[PDB]
DNA sequence: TTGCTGGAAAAATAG
DNA sequence: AACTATTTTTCCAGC
């Protein structure tokens, strides 16, 4: 049986259920990196998959593979591979095999555990778009294609010769590291140019502007060179919520004969930095 | 050393 | 070719 085939959750007395859905969020790890864990449950544990209606007494194999996010087109995702985790914290044995270009990871579904299984041994590896897209015949695009689904399936051998094949897909999971949390970001400036002298006040409205927010003007080179840094004084004596009043600093060289492009950003901590804002100093 | 990550800087890209 | 604005990969540091 193919991985693309539209199997179903149930089939008469049989029914594959995802007792515990994974978290909506899970950062995948790259080859050039160390494992980033197994998919975790929103609670704190991990996902749980169970087969209902298996009165038989023989352990079955539960397959796991990462697939696309759209239900209508459950396909294994071309830019992600299930990753087999192992060792101490991993209460579930597991073997892996390749099927097509897909890594599939099998887990045991045991009658003694009521065909109930804990998926704490499956992590997610991220392939490089470039590498995948060079594969002849593939047309899926990687860029911005970071949602995926954990796809579970099992093959039920009926003593009557034929096998019932079931499958269940988890809720989508976001695999791209969400970078910000408590970051401050400018959305509206007030002034974007000024004379080398500065002294002019610039109003800045954005998000997450704390009582200890700072504004730093910087100048680079076309080769990304930090040739100028300079903190701007921010009227903290008073201010509206998410609105910072900045005093444009004087440009290092008041003798420039042509306008110079420069950047400024907002900082709340040694690592809490906004996106680089644009500014221009004009020769007097 | 294994994982295992959080946080990021460095490297790539789309327009 | 070079820019910016965004995304993706690689690195680094702390267990």
Residue with the two structure tokens 């015949």: A137
Residue reference for tokens 């997450």: A208
Select from A138, A168, A144 the least CA-distant residue to A65: A168
What tokens were used for A45? 């544990």
Whole-number distance in Å between A75 CA and C6 C1': 27
User: Strand A60-67 to strand A48-52: parallel, antiparallel, or no bridges (unpaired)?
Assistant: unpaired
Resolution in units of Å: 3.0
By C-alpha to C1' distance, B4 is nearest to A36
| Bridge-based pairing state of the strands A102-109 and A147-157 | unpaired
Two structure tokens written together for A203: 């109003």
Q: Please list, in sequence order, all residues whose beta carbon lies within 8 angstroms of the beta carbon of residue A258, skipping any fewer than 6 positions away.
A: A283
Hits for CB < 7 Å against strand B across A residues 19-38 = 27, 29, 33-38
Residues lying close to strand B (Cβ under 7 A), chosen from 172-201 of chain A, are: 177, 179, 181
* Protein fold of A3-175: Immunoglobulin-like (2.60.40)
The CATH number of the domain covering residues in A176-284: 2.60.40.10
Please give the nucleotide, over all strands, whose C1' is closest to the CA of residue A132. Answer: C8
The experimental technique used to determine this model is: X-ray
Judge whether A104 and A152 are in contact, CB under 8 Å: no
CA of A35 to C1' of B4 (A): 6
> Taking all atoms of strand C, which protein residues have CB closer than 7 Å?
A 30-34, 126, 128-130, 142-146, 176-177, 222, 261, 275-276, 278
Q: Which residue is nearest to nucleotide B10 (CA to C1')?
A: A224
Sorted by sequence, the CB contacts under 8 Å of residue A167 that are 6+ apart come out as A7, A8, A9, A16, A74, A151, A152, A153, A154
- CA–CA separation, A52 vs A46, rounded Å? 19
**Could you check: is the Cβ of residue A60 within 7 Å of any atom of nucleic acid strand B?**
no
Of all nucleotides in the shown strands, which has a C1' nearest the CA of A176? C8
- Inter-residue contact A172 to A150 (CB < 8 Å): no
Q: Which residues pair with A103 in a beta bridge?
A: A98
Q: Please identify which residue in the block is written with the tokens 């927010």.
A: A213
Every domain range in chain A assigned CATH 2.60.40.10: 176-284
Residue that is written with structure tokens 């992590």 in the block: A123
Task: Kindly state the greatest CA–CA separation across chain A.
Answer: 92
Q: Could you give the residue range(s) of every CATH 2.60.40.340 domain in chain A?
A: 3-175
């Amino acid at each position: 049986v193919p991985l693309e085939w539209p199997l179903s959750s149930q089939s008469g007395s049989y029914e594959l259920r995802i007792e515990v859905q994974p978290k909506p969020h899970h950062r995948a790890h790259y080859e050039t990196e160390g494992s980033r864990g197994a998919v975790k449950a929103p609670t704190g544990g991990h996902p749980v998959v169970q087969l209902h209606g298996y009165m038989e007494n023989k352990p079955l194999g539960l397959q796991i593979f990462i697939g696309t996010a759209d239900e209508r087109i459950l396909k294994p995702h071309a830019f992600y591979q299930v990753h087999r985790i192992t060792g101490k914290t991993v209460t579930t044995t597991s073997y892996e095999k390749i099927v097509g270009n897909t890594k599939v990871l099998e887990i045991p579904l045991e009658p003694k555990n009521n065909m109930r299984a804990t998926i704490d041994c499956a992590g997610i590896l991220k392939l490089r778009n470039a590498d995948i897209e060079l594969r002849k015949g593939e047309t899926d695009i990687g860029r911005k294609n970071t949602r995926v689904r954990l796809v579970f399936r099992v093959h039920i051998p009926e003593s009557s010769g034929r096998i019932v094949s079931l499958q269940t897909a988890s809720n989508p999971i976001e695999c791209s590291q969400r970078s910000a949390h408590e970051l401050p970001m400018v959305e509206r400036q007030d002034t974007d140019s000024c004379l080398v002298y500065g002294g002019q006040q610039m109003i800045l409205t954005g998000q997450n502007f704390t009582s200890e927010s700072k504004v730093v003007f910087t100048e680079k080179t076309t080769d990304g060179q930090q040739i100028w840094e300079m903190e701007a004084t921010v009227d903290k004596d008073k201010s509206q919520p998410n609105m910072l009043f900045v005093e444009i600093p004087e440009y290092r060289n008041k003798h420039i004969r042509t306008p110079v492009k420069v950047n400024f950003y907002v900082i709340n901590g040694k690592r809490k930095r906004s996106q680089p804002q644009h500014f221009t100093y004009h020769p007097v």
